[PDB]
């Protein structure tokens, strides 16, 4: 009854190889196949997101 969902780690988090091939394996995990731009907003912040926003943003 008294716990916080967000403070807990995600459930799927719970469970030799060449270094360059490991680097190419964990470079492919990003959606753009490269580390994200630091000072760039994500896709949700951008206004070219096709889905309509909340009503208060429309009034603003």
């Amino acid at each position: 009854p008294d716990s916080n969902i967000y403070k807990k780690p995600p459930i799927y988090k719970q469970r030799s190889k060449h270094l360059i091939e490991d680097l190419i394996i964990e470079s492919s995990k990003f959606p753009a196949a490269q580390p994200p731009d630091p000072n760039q907003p994500a896709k949700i912040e951008t206004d070219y997101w096709p889905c309509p926003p909340s009503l208060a943003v429309v009034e603003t």
């Binding site: 969902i5 967000y6 459930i11 719970q14 492919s28 995990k29 990003f30 096709p50 309509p52």
Partner: protein, 374 residues
């Protein structure tokens, strides 16, 4: 793991779409077809490919027997489905399935073994850390940005109406109709024989599908449109075959989609999509019916015939009481909405506890999906 982004795989009878969570558009969209050769091979040394998946089967339609692994939303053949998923993961996206969670979609009313087989295949063959199965109707409501409304989703395989009020879903009001786009394709291929054009194999079925996509619309008034078409030749168009032959579609343009509204053309005695939506609304409670009238949502590729929204609004307004206000909401990108809201579902913080873990699957067998997933 903030770095790990889940893959959203919108899985339908006609097309398969795939992408990453938090993206506005899927990365890879391709038809879900499997083809095998049907003619003798006399040139040695050309190769040894015996199965064509995706656009490679669509390009070489001449020498293949195209067939669909998914029929009416049910995976009839599972080997071809494994083929499609392998081609999706390795060749279209170039990702390792063992590093990411996978989000999958299905129709509301299904045989119960379909979910168990899907979960078992995704956990054993691909070694995914986690997976989840969602219903395609809820994801359209996620994409529309509203918490309340009725979702009418008609794709290539199945049509279904699901009402949700204030984030709460009524299961007894969910309606499923097996009328879909392949039945419209078969009806078009049947009625095209009146003008002398015969299409009989699978490649010509793809040709008829292209004709239906390019040259079709829904008439606001059926009898007036029929009288206009009989009066003159203003409602005529020309299409060029890959043979270079030119055919004139003529009267049939508004006759193929009309089978959605009058299923008696196809021999089925079921009600139309407008009557199904009205029945699903009227099965709900009295107090919430106005909000469901104000927030009707259209989804799926099959609902992109021109003028379907006006006809739907007119028919529902005729059925509904006069004092109520009727609105039909049809986004211009609705074909991908089932995918898009799904990505939103993978982007939420509270959804990270809703994944079916590999450890939970190992503990509870394949039947964990019934008690974990809606």
């Amino acid at each position: 793991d903030d770095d790990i982004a889940a893959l959203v795989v919108d899985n339908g009878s006609g097309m398969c779409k795939a992408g990453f969570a938090g993206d506005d558009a899927p990365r890879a969209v391709f038809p879900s077809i499997v083809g095998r050769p049907r003619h003798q091979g006399v040139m040695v040394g050309m190769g040894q490919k015996d199965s064509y998946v995706g656009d490679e089967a669509q390009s070489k339609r001449g020498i293949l027997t195209l067939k669909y692994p998914i029929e009416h939303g049910i995976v009839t053949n599972w080997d071809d489905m494994e083929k499609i998923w392998h081609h999706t993961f390795y060749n279209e996206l170039r990702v390792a399935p063992e590093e990411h969670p996978v989000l999958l979609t299905e129709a509301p009313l299904n045989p119960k073994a379909n979910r168990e087989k899907m979960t078992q295949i995704m956990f054993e063959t691909f070694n995914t850390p986690a997976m989840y199965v969602a219903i395609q109707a809820v994801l359209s409501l996620y994409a529309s940005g509203r918490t309340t409304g009725i979702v009418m989703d008609s794709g290539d395989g199945v049509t279904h109406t699901v009402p949700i009020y204030e984030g709460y879903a009524l299961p007894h009001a969910i309606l499923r109709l097996d009328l879909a786009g392949r039945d419209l394709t078969d009806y078009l291929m049947k009625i095209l024989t009146e003008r002398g054009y015969s299409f009989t194999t699978t490649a010509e079925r793809e040709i008829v599908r292209d004709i239906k996509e390019k040259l079709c619309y829904v008439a606001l008034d059926f009898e007036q449109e029929m009288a206009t078409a009989a009066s003159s030749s203003s409602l005529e168009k020309s299409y060029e075959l890959p043979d270079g032959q030119v055919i004139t579609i003529g009267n049939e343009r508004f006759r193929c989609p009309e089978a959605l509204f009058q299923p008696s053309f196809l021999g089925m005695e079921s009600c139309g999509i407008h009557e199904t939506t009205f029945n699903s609304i009227m099965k709900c409670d009295v107090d919430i019916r106005k909000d469901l009238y104000a927030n009707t949502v259209l989804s799926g590729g099959t609902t992109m015939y021109p003028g379907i929204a006006d006809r739907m609004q007119k028919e529902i307004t005729a059925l509904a009481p006069s004092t109520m206000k009727i609105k039909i909401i049809a986004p211009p990108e609705r074909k991908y909405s089932v995918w898009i809201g799904g990505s939103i579902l993978a982007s939420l913080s509270t959804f990270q506890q809703m994944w079916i873990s590999k450890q939970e699957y190992d503990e509870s067998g394949p039947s964990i999906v019934h008690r974990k997933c809606f």
